[PDB]
Symmetry: D2
Subunit: 359 residues, 4 copies
Amino acid sequence: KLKIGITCYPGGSGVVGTELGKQLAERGHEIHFITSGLPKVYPNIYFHEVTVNFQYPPYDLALASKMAEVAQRENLDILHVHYAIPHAICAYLAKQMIGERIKIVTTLHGTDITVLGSDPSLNNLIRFGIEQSDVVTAVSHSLINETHELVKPNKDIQTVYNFIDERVYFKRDMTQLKKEYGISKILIHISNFRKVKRVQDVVQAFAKIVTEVDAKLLLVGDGPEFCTILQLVKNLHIEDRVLFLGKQDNVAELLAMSDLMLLLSEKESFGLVLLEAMACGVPCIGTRVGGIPEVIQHGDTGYLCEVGDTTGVADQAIQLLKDEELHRNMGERARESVYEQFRSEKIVSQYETIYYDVL
Amino acid sequence: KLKIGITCYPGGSGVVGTELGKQLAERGHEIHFITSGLPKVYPNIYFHEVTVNFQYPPYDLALASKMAEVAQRENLDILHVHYAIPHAICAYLAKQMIGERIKIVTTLHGTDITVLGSDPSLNNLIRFGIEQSDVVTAVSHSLINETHELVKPNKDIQTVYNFIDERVYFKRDMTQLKKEYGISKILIHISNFRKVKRVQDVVQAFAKIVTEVDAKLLLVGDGPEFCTILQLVKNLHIEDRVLFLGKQDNVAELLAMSDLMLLLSEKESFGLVLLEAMACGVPCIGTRVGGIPEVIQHGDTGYLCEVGDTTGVADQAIQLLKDEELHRNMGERARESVYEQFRSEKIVSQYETIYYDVL
Amino acid sequence: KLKIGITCYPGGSGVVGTELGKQLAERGHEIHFITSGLPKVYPNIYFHEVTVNFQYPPYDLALASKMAEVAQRENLDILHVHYAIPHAICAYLAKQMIGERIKIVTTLHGTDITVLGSDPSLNNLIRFGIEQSDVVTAVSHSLINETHELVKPNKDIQTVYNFIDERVYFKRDMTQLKKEYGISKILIHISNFRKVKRVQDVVQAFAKIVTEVDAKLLLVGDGPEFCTILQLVKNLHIEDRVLFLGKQDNVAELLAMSDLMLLLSEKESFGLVLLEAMACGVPCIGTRVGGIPEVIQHGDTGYLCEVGDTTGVADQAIQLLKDEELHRNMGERARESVYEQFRSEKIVSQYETIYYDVL
Amino acid sequence: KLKIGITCYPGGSGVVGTELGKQLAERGHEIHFITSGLPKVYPNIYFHEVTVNFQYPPYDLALASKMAEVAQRENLDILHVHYAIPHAICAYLAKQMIGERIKIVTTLHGTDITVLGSDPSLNNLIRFGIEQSDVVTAVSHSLINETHELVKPNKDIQTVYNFIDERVYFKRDMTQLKKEYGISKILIHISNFRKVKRVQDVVQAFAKIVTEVDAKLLLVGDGPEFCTILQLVKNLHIEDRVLFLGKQDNVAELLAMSDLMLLLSEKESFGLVLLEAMACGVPCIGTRVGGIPEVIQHGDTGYLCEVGDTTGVADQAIQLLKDEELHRNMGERARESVYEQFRSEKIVSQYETIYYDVL
């Protein structure tokens, strides 16, 4: 019984935004995606797309215009936006344009605050956008901290973690697929191969972790630092032991046939792959960086460690890989604490009450 | 046994390009998508994406660079590109950059020739791109005509029609879904609501076709001319009889629960929806514009008619809607001639032999 | 004694905006140009530039941010913007961001209303921007009409015509330059060679006007329709009689050594070249399209005529070219009515009082 | 007696490219600027502009297309391009498109190699572009070194330094202007306020250099690091001693009324301001970074020093500021060695012989 409008980019935000809309739809709400791109068929989910046509094509203004148009045409109640720039400001304009007859909900996520908020040319813009939203939420407490530190908004930010569709991530085992990939221990890592992900360390740790255990490394994803990483596995003589799989999308099957997940980036606010992973009963070893610690509880559902500690990571890995007792327990502990505090139906309900509350 | 690289935009070209790659993959070939965007999981389909970072971000050059890099790194045999600008020229640069150790296959499609070729600032560029490709194909003979008329290239262009994944389009019936949409005759129309699609005529014809038959019009899609069309159904008192469904993606289910498809645009080189439609046993009434006539054979699998003939279209419709004999036959004739000359496995084989031939 | 901030694109708007700032500066005001681009040296004119760094680079938002920053940092009084999209909306955001402690003055001009206002994806956006500005002005009454017709804003729009720097346009004669160009009657035409300018008609009329008078045609400017026009002068055997000069900037000298100016576009809201021209004592023959009629008074300072009337234009030209009495009078009448109602110091004072008034 | 086509961005390259074209024109050559933007009036200098109209607007391809079109239409001899990406590759395409009936001259400059060449996504592209040009030159030997280090092209690169229009930079003195700015020693610094320019050090050094000498600092330019620098002069209590002048263009007058120029960036390949400066009889103190050392000969025409040596710079400054003997000599020595090896008419002749030679 609610008309919601979602806006996002079909990276991490898109996955969540889209899934949140799909869920909300199944609960009888009428969802209206307002986004230029490409997010079965639901009778209660409509897709509006921003068409553009001057120095730079006004996508921002165009998006604001469409939000406003869809808003008053479909008589939307809530307008839920997902990255901060530009969406937050666009929703503000839209609101002002339709006489403020709508409620804005802004969800923050990693880079919009982490990296964008750092840029002085957009600081005041991000602040204004946050302060002007009716309700603001973040994906992790670490983020709400980073926000008050860099942007310094005079607004309250709630915490609502991201979720995963369990109907897509289960402990199924692709034993027939391992054959199709040519293998037998499996170590999987998913990222956008950027410097911040520190993919080099995932390799270094594997170079070591491999001398004492026979296992292959699945490198899902593609990005700038690809060649460097390729050059690395190359003059490290682990070349035939790493499967660059390039960027995949349906990574659910890959995690399923995995044993250990690695995430050793310099920063991160959240981020699902951990969930996806854990969700599939796969224990993780992520760096202790703001936001990983809120999902991985050391020793119970995975392990943490300082950035750059290639050696320490390997050690922690080699140990967990042989002990099959600890590995069956951790992997179970993990997919449990996930169902526990990251249950999709649970989180969706938090957003649901936030909407009702803002009215 | 072939390493192919596909490039496209995940409009019409993307659908085909992507599907062609999926098919080729299932046949054991190793497909390498080289495109910045987002096109189950196949072990033999890799996705490489173009990352950019100056006046305008050099996407073209960047794409050329990545084609070249992937080409010689993975040792590709063929590089199959799909729209002409820029892809054709990018593949040329890529080729020149890797010492010409690769074969370029360019597939033309609607607008790249239709509208772009019209622009003098890109004429010579499109020509050069075509002439430099090793093999060039078009989606319809009408296109090969338009090409030799506007661009005037000194190269031979073959004809290879587009196809549809029958594994997605069948005569299934969503009788339970009609209920979910609130209905009972069904008339469906899919487009990007641009002036060229002449959506106004689809409405005019429906305004008439409705006075003599009770049916609702499904308007799938969203674009610039949306408001105008909305204003039209509005002061035409057919407002409660048209279901703007906004732009959908999984339109397979909608066509399934349809009876008649309309396409009355000023121009078109192909275009699938006809196929999709027909494929689902849905007879079509499209304008006699270069390229529709090669799929719709009047009276046997659908009907044609001059552009702007709102009245003639309605008449042709009202007639076919009641005669249930003619409608069961046409709908059968249609999904047959589709399996006939547009069989996915058939077309894929043509492209397959074209690759082998170019070597 | 006023701190003004100007924003524009260094086409027509830029020329005016920039000149207006230069003038205002000489009057002791402190001008602050807020624009990313490149508009002697004045101690009271500062240049702030928008730096950008995501789907599309947020130039709009960035500009809004900089307006806000400069505004409260330099404590600006007025923020004068010149095209409507995006500047109008950017100034709105800026205002809202600095607590509304600033006055927004929006000046409309041709295409922002003429062509942009036509696009439904930006209609409501242009309206909102206009309505939100504190003062709004247009360059011609024709524009204020077009505005209320297409955009339909609930705001009052004043009329303030554009001006020309007489310190740059005088009746000087470049008799030594005609030699440098290889000539002796001179017909000059300046445009962006777009279809709307109807450069073809300027040629057709010249093809005729030439059979009865020996004169060359100066085609200043460059654009899409260039080749077509080049092809035209070509198979019209006037090839050696037309001087494509390509796009020039310091056109003051060219107009100086001219005799008749032609402007036969389908539409135009203003536009200076007429002024520049007239200002140089050069009589003009422009089509009777909304906004030309407010500068050219037929027979007294030039002639008007229907669009497409190539023949009528030629006739009117050939006649005025020989009668040397009428030509000395008109050319004098013209540069007078220009000093009269378009005096730079006069118009600048209107804008000046508008600023003071808005406080 | 030569038809040359120049391509550039109206930063440093634009200044040089444009001036080079102006000079070449005065020598009787027919210059054809092929560039989308805005670079008196010369009868032998034509301006062609690239018009664009899809994912990203194909400016590169469009530029290539226009180069080709202008090339064979005007029958150009040489095509001289100035930054490497994209212009080098565009000229390659253009050449290939007109049957190679043209000679390409590529001039390298700072960032195209320095920063772009660093990016692996454009490495091979820059190399290919260089190797494919018929003649390649750089602005400094330091650059030719950086080039062979990062890009590693198999091509020969000549050295041709940048020049300055002496007809714009002379030892004139704006004593009347100092009054208009409110001053009396004058220290001037020009940059784009980027981190690489290390504007902070220019301030630190001034904070010190000021305690022992009364002088104001002219900070010409605007960029990202502006606020930080503004915050610095702020909590350094030198606030009323620094004249942020924002970004100026006609900086000739400012240098004229200056005494010492500072340039303490981490890197630089050339760069004129030194020339401009010196040219005006203003001694400079620049960091010893690859390319500054080829213009500043320590002690004879200026001083060099390690980066970050705020103290050492101040010391060197305070010393030269009082000794009025050394300051009159250095300032004279400087504007001499400039006329010496950077004489505009001299450099232009080098480029001129390079063109003739390539034929």
